[PDB]
Symmetry: D3
Subunit: 157 residues, 6 copies
């Protein structure tokens, strides 16, 4: 009955993201991870690579599935008969641009956004910072799922 | 069966609170509003009065119930077979002390906390500020449930 | 002879901006909306000026002008030394705080900040354009004028 | 006939407050400093008024008055509907933001915020009192008047 | 030659504090932990108890010593021939009251303040929240040194 | 032997930077100012010009030296036998992205980061804003070292 969408670009997915997926899957009957693709800028990983990395590290979550999309998040959510977004947060500044988008999304489509505090251990990892650190040789193995780390190193090499 | 607890003192309940209750009730199978009884801090309304005002305001939410409690919030939550809290936010600053408490609550009892931004309309209302304004004759009727406003005028007479 | 300047790119002007214009117009004798030329956006400077002028017709003490370079030069060349800027968050206070203190330092121009009306608090020109581009209804967030004009740019 | 009110407890008035008074006086025709009666602090209301009056002698369009209850009633009973308040951080913006939006809602009174001068940015009445109490030199942070008066309260 | 003071009320010391002590001791020739006592309000622990709990959990830091004081921090620092304070931080809001005091302290005494980000694992523990959680029975054993936890439980009982 | 690295692009160095350098040099036995060379982002001054401007401004700091570098900052730091970074702050917002980077840097290489609030006088100056103001003829001479200001007028002519 109940359900939420967990959106992001997940390029690549991090252990911070996985933490949020797990907590959403524990509290909602179904969870859809929404991999948002910009048709005008390729990330590091193709859509199929992003989805596979997420599937491989969520195999123990039976009520979670992964789908890509583009355009308005709230269209993705409503077309699936849902009206909740779950998003991970780190700081009060993350709460400002995110609050703006959450209130816009409620205004235009009646979709609710629930924020959850990331786990402390994973709180400083972001996809962008992990990529940037890995590019210049820093060790980010503890911040990313096994499904990701060596594929990341391969892309950089 | 999914479920969440919405905690507060609600002295009195505001439309900001009600907005959070409605969004919780829309997304979880069961919601419990947990009204804090504080042996010391005695506010304007008794616990029974506060429960009654919440029940009037939430009469159209069949999957939401109101109960009072004391002590550790995560004990209240786990005693009812739940492991989620839903709390309303207004600022990035409220994210800071609330983030600390959410991480603590996860650590000591494995209870998740989901934050939701209250509607823009009700974002500057708080129980304490509504009482203060009403005390000096300002009009806060657009910010409180109808029944609450009526009761609040009584306590001031 | 009090007065203030309300700066921005206004591409396009939103109800959030208009709210700030109205409050500045109510508290200062003279208000000048300063439209940045900085080529690059969706609307030309002329179109942006036109849309602001259409939306502020009931504000007799407001006028709209374009400019570039330092805002403080715009302000002082018109005999004024106050800027009025609308806010939303504590984050916006921070980068805006830096510029306000720089502007005070280099030109003695004061900056007054005003909180956005709660209803218009999540709208920005960029977010409104983005949502409208993907078909979301932003008609409640923009002056009637502007909204029809935006639909024109997209179709 | 523009005007604004600058509220506070001013126990005592600091150079940070005076900076804000001067900026408000420069941009509005009429400025009223509103001194909260709320008994409880170090200086009596009369003494606080006196110290502000001493420090603003060169501001012809400023006056000082006491009051209690709702600030918006103070403001509107004097025919005005603007508050000018000085800031320091994004945190202060947040609790002040809540009150500004409430005040707008209940009485239609606008609040304009101004950034503290960098030099006066870490001084507050409470911190100045605390430091002075333990013998720290706060003479650069307070009007000359006030500083001598504070030394008197401590000895 | 070089030295810093690490101040606080440490009532009681937490693992977050210890992390800061260890990092300061690694970067300065000498570190003084300054236990600040309010002569007009007793905390949970007496000054001697606070000092003993800190000494017991800093025994592997040979260049650290612990002293109590009151009044102006900058007097404590300067009377020891030092002019640096090291303080742990958690958030940007912690940076606001702390920035005010750091700039005041530089103004009145020329003392510098260096802030260090707490370790993620210890980021949500504070003395006050640990005491509050422990009072109502929550498990805070992982957030406090061994020198503290059972002494805390004893005070509460 | 204690020591810290003060990183930046310094294009050009400001009095805000200099204030940080002086406080670092006063508290550590050795300070290294690390000037970023970016293969892409070519600013207004060459790396050699930036190093020379910093050296003029820091002529009275005998325990401070200036060097350029590329890639991962923690590699630069550890290659020089150090494990501390000193960075200047202005806001709570700057605490947020910098906090993330400090926790990352500690995690991947065990390098500590110490933050210091710049003097109130120099708290609104930044290299980018100084250049922008100077470009349009505004006077930023009170915000930059004398030599820098002279050089900056040259690049604009
Ligand atoms: O909102 C709160 O802080 C709070 C905390 C603990 C509580 C415990 C209860 F049993 C009931 C309500 C509660 C609210
Ligand atoms: O939006 C701004 O920051 C901005 C900056 C500079 C400006 C200069 C002008 F002449 C006019 C508007 C201006 C707006
Ligand atoms: O400092 C304040 O928030 C404050 C509040 C209410 C006031 C009412 C008055 F009549 C005068 C000053 C006042 C200041
Ligand atoms: O300030 C920075 O972001 C930065 C980062 C990395 C660096 C690496 C170096 F080798 C030298 C300076 C550096 C500055």
């Amino acid at each position: 009955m109940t359900g939420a969408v967990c959106p992001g670009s997940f390029d690549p997915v991090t252990l911070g993201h996985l933490d949020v997926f797990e907590r959403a899957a524990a509290q909602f009957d179904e969870v859809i991870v929404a991999v948002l693709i910009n048709p005008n800028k390729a990330g590091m990983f193709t859509v199929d690579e992003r989805i596979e990395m997420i599937r491989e590290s969520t195999a123990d979550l039976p009520n979670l599935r992964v789908e890509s999309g583009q355009g308005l998040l709230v269209d993705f959510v409503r077309e699936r008969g849902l009206n909740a977004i779950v998003k991970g947060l780190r700081t009060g500044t993350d709460f400002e641009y995110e609050l703006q988008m959450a209130q816009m999304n409620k205004h235009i489509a009646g979709v609710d956004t629930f924020f959850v505090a990331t786990a402390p251990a994973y709180s400083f990892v972001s996809s962008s910072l992990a990529k940037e650190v890995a590019t210049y040789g820093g060790d980010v193995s503890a911040l990313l799922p096994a499904s990701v780390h060596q594929r990341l190193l391969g892309k950089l090499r």
